[model samples]
Target: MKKVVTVCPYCASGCKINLVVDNGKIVRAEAAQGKTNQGTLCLKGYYGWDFINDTQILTPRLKTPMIRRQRGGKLEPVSWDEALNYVAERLSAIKEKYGPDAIQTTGSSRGTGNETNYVMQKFARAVIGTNNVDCCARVXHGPSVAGLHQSVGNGAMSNAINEIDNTDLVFVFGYNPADSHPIVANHVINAKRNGAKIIVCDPRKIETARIADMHIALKNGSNIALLNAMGHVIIEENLYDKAFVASRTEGFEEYRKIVEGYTPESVEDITGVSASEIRQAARMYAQAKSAAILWGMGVTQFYQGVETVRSLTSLAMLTGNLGKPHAGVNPVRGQNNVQGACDMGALPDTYPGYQYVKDPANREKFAKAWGVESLPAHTGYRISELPHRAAHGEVRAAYIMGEDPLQTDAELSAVRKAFEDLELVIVQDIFMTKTASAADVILPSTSWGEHEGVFTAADRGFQRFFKAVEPKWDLKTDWQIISEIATRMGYPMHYNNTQEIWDELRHLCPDFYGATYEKMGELGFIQWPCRDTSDADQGTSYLFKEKFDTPNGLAQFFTCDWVAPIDKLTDEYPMVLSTVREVGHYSCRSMTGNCAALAALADEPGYAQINTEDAKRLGIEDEALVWVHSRKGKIITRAQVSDRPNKGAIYMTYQWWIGACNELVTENLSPITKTPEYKYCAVRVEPIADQRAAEQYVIDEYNKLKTRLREAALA
Candidate 1:
């Protein structure tokens, strides 16, 4: 048996693990003693291992030039040569006819860093000749990135997860790591063991909240009001760190006046949290010797997501939690290497190292680096706009790598419809995802355990992963496929391996100036901003230690007033549907749901988790079928009666296709970041008599896809 250590690609904790491989297969996967996983896997990591070895894997599905027709009213497989050439020709034609902006691509965050950094971004800029490339970040922390940068000097995580264990008090918002970020929960537990107070502010009493000292189950979509209320109480009670506010933060005086208006009583009316509870939360966070704030998509997926993060940053600043050891505003990223992807300039708006691509100097640097001249000067739309743009004839082709957006997108139905209008859809994944099934060209790629790359986790730590085995079949790494296509086309990017790409990236990025594959092999992994050899010893920590990176070298305060959700509770839609996650589920069901063991644990397609009182009023008994409806659509599913949920609220997991929560969700998005408000939406529930009505739903849904595809081809 041979032991190999690599970073866990599933979650942000980036738990390093030791895989015991016998012959060829990984026999036993165990966490390294000192690595992030410690000695456990929160269902997905533990049971989802088969994904690498799954028999359904489409290895070396290089038959790219596929020919297709609306046969049996559905897309049937065709020849590869026909598919690739058509895609290349159509994309070029789109560029020639409508300009480069008309052709955009959507990259995946779940894949290895090499794919996101080298292949995905390379295809969008070099081959397509457009800066209009985005990723799944728009759906997750788009607001957090844009908003935090305005208030803080940097647009990344303010502190590491270890800060949670060291802090005197820890405040959680909209995020419940007990289910999503379970590894980080260990530090929270350790903090409690050491007499540190833990508080969680969320709409639902999640598992983490149940364990919290004080769980403020604030009303959904009321984050701005709730956070401002805490700010109000801190200012009113004079519990704020006046010195820190004056010295570290800018626009303090003006922002203080606005927060002063959100008194406990004023905010209490808007948010469902009480005035006294707000006061207690404020005093606990402000009076603590040190405090750290942890946030998740719960705070970032709203219409006011970015502003919401700014509000948290403000709270941290008022309490003097910026530069200290245990106190800073932190974002628990939904994906493993999301932070690193952005820092490496993976966004449409920015070049490598978060440098704005729109800036002439930044563009010139990348243009010169890649041997291209006069790159596009403007930024492009988020991934959410890809399908929308495709339907409007703005975007004609896409290359999806290691992502399944059919289930991940906020509005799955809308996204599915929009893709029907695309001229070319290329999906590169290890397995056939629903998104891949819709692809005109399917390219199988190397699995996580079978490939080599560098991954930058949410902690801002970089780790190197080595290839454990040769490709299972014709499968290749994403880089190989991209390079092959680039070669087939005009641009010939010659590189022996992904390591060469990293060597070049280090030269262009100041933070990773000295990074190299050889250095990574020697050092294992290290955080960025390893500015030099002396600095490499130190690695990296929170930025803005000595000064802010803003124009004035000062962090700005964005004082935002409270705003209400677009879809308010109406007479028809009386109940507020709060979609939550589970210990077994990942961002979407692409990986976890495919696992038999994990799916068995969550066997029921979905359950409308409702309060016992509400269930009793609706004649809902154990295992009763009922129709959950909204203004847009409805689904009939079994109900799990429980008193755990608050009145006028219910819960659903994001793991199933039968009762997709997105179908009924409102399309309202944050005006600034364009993140759909999936946290809070209104719904109505009624008992279903027979299962026949729901059975038709299963059949009609399948038929609709067939009909949509035919219509698209005809057009």
Candidate 2:
């Protein structure tokens, strides 16, 4: 019996655990005393390790690299030499024919660690000579990065996860931590236990709202209106910190003008909350000794995503929450390594450490280090724009690594057509996903437990995860595959280990200079801005202790007028379909869906949560199969009648392929950030005529998908 320590490869709660291995198999997972989780873990950490054994419960693992000689041809197994050469030649040809902008690359926000993302952006810039590199951040918190960068000169959570319990008040807007992240939800509970006032503002009566001191159940698509009204109340009542606004912040007068009109009474119709309730919530937030504002995809997946984020930052700035403990704006990340992906320069506009690519000095530094004469100056296309751009022939090739865009993209119809339009599609992943099944080439990579590297937690902490078990099949690491392709492409890249890559990264980005593998050893957590390597110099927990990260050392105020949602509820589509998360399943459900216990707990064509009154009116009973349709497409799902959901709005988790919610979501994105408006879309839910037939349809559809992926992997 042996136990190997590693971080839980689920959400960004950053729980550490020990994998108990016997005879080279991971038998069990137990929680370790991690800095963020404090020896506690959710069900995922304890029951989500059996997928590493190639259980094939839901899908089979890719055993080898496979490629098709021509598009739409059979995928045949190939040697590493042939696969690398083929990919390099194809990418180079694409670059030469259509220019580097035609090539699109992605960094994995899932299990693939920070080093691989750094290598991926490097390969795209120095090898392919393009800035067309991004990850899932575009769909998640792209606004948080762009908005917070413009306002505060930093995008991450300014407070530490451990500080949640000590806060005087928690103003939770639009995010439901209990379902999205349990470990973080535990921290909120601990804060409640410590006599902290909790205020929840969400359309749904979420778990947090149940325990909140005041749950302002605002209507959906009114995030900005509600936020502006709160600001209006604080400023109108003279409760704002005048000193902080005058000294530590800029644009106070202009921001005041912008938020002046959105009083509690003015936005009452839009927000669906009473003016008195809004005023009380504002007073509670501003009068607290310290308050932490937490949000998630609920705030980011709207057309006003970036501006809404700016409003959140404005409230924090107005209240003097910039440079203190237990106070700041927190956008809790959804994926495990999404923060790490963004930190490693996977975004289109910036290099690693948030260095802008448009800057001549930053470009020169990277070009000199990567041995390139120059780099692309133009910002690349985001993931939300790729399908539309590919259809228009702007992007000819897509090299997707460790991501399943076909299953996760907002519009399945457009995504499927874009892949068909692409000249080349390369999918690098562990399992055969919907995206992998459509690839011209499939590159097999080792799973998380089979590889050791560093992953940045949600709160900017860099910690090392050791390999817990050997690979189930002959698979290559993500960085190794990327380096091989870059070398074959005439870039001449190589690395002995992840530490070498980490060292190279540290040297390039001063923010990560002191996060050596030694410092972030077995149990150490080193946050960013650790520039010095002294024993006494521990990393930063909360950023901006003295001043903001802006050039003038003052946080700017960025806010705008509220806007209505793109999709509307018409006579045909009466219900609003909002996509949400599943407690037992992670992103796209490739890994967790394969775990036996998780699959048994929640499986196939998950339920659509609806209000009991709505369900009864529609002739739909609880647990009955229902047909959910939109202007774009339709799918079958189960109906779960509950009072937790608000009237005229239904929720569906996005992981179920049999009832893929994305197919029903129209392609509407934020104009600034290109983030899909996934939180608000109109749909119609109708009852199925025959319950037994619908059950059979679900089984048949699920089996068909599983069979195709399994056969594809085996073939």
Candidate 3:
């Protein structure tokens, strides 16, 4: 057996692993002692590869191109030439008739590598002549980038994952790395083992909170209030770094004025945390020699997500934590290469390296490089806005790559309507996903083990992943598929290898200009802003060491006001339902669902985690079928009576289609980033009389919707 070294394609932690291959199949996997993980493989990293070999239980991999001749017709197998030619002709007619703004494309953030994303965006701008290109980051960290850039000048994480060991204190706010990112969780555990103070502030007693020194279990949608009170305490007690604030920050007085009203006593009722506990946490964090802050979707999935981030960043800057080795605000990313996708300019408003698309000089520079006369001047539509635009005939065509918006996006019925209304729908993926079922054209793409490319970890490390197995049948890399489509559309993008793509990328994006394939191969990985690589120096681990990348080289603070959730609790809906994630599965469960081991661990319709008191009041038993009803829809799930959720709060993961919780989530969004408020939704739970009937009702309702969609397509 030959062992091939590669990076885990699960989450953003990106742990290094060795795939034990024998007879053209990966038998097992083991850790390879990478920098971030220090030789630790999570369950997903070890058994996640089973999806690539699961031929019996899962949908067969796409082995040929498919096209639908009519709107209501079945998809027919076609050669690559026919598929590309049809797509080119249709895209050309759409552009000529409705203009470039009517067409949009979405790049993948999962296993598709950085080279694929770079060329995908290049195709959107150079071939389609539209800046309407984005990724799944719009749903997850869109607010983080917009909010963090406004606060700290850069949206990415400030420090590397391995730097957690050097901290004296770690404030885990609204994030549970133990489940979402187990590899990074190990670093936190190591920090705790080394005597660092770990403080967790969340609605649930997450796994990390089990070992934390302090667990301030605040209420849902109360992050901004809690953080603002902490800021008030820091300022009232004079614990903040005055010298740093005066020298390296702006808008201090305005921020102080806004947070002063959020005294500990005043916000205790709203946050469900005591005044003394808030004071204690504030003092501990501010007085520590070296402290860091880490957060997740909990802080960025609400109406006040951007404001919550602003307050968190203000707290960090007030304590002289910016541009330090062991202290900064780090927002843990969801997808494996989300940060890289954003860096490669897979966004509506920015070019590569976060360059503004509206800037004439930036547009001119890119157009000159691509041999074009001009580029798009106006910004494009975001992912969340695409559905509405398509419904209104503003967006006539869409090219989706490796995203299951039908299952993953909020408001299920509305997403289906938009897809049905569009004139053309193209999907490129390894499997026939729910979104692909609605596509007019389906293109086959290679999976992770069958592709050679680079993935950027959550900490900004660009590591190389070599192909361990050959493509199954007529499968192509995402970059090749995109390049072929571009060539057929009259824009010739011929690259010999991914190295050439990376070279072109670095030349356009200065932050990665020094990160060469040769250098990265010798060093395992290289972070961005790596200006020097000859001396075996690792890339920038912690940004803003000397100065921030702002207009004045100083951090800025925004005086944001905390807003309440759009859907508040009432007598009819006394409980709040918050969507979460599972350790054994990923988004949509397209890949993880096919793995036998992972499915065995978490194969169920779904469960609503409610407090024991609430369960007892409703006469609901553990693992008993119950009807969870919201304003939008209702789902039948088993009750998981536990103390993890606070009173009047229930938690459920939205990965399952049988009892999808997204149906209960609303379209209420953040004004700044347009991210859905998936964290806080009013709900109520009731016991079902007939267990079998309730279970079948949920399944029938889901199937009924799919049948209606199929019938409409045939009409």
Compared with the true structure, all predictions reach lDDT values of 0.72, 0.88, 0.84
For residues 572-685, write the lDDT of model 1, one tens digit per residue: 666888776666767556566556676667643578888887778877766766788877678666788887777788887666566778777766767777788887778888
TM-score, one value per model: 0.93, 0.98, 0.96
Q: Give the per-residue Cα lDDT of candidate 2 at 257.
A: 91
Cα RMSDs of all predictions? 3.6, 1.2, 2.4
Which prediction has more favorable TM-score, 1 or 3?
Answer: 3
Give the Å shift of residue 298 in candidate 1: 1.9
Give per-residue CA lDDT, model 3, range 353-426, as digits (tens).
77888999999999999999888988888878887899889999898898888888877777888888899999
Name the lDDT value of residue 540 in candidate 2: 91
Model 2: residues with Cα > 4 Å off, grouped in runs: none
2 against 3, candidate with superior lDDT: 2
Per-residue lDDT of candidate 2, residues 214-297 (tens digit): 999888898888988999999999999999999999999998997789989999899999889989998999988999998888
Better of 1 and 3 by lDDT: 3
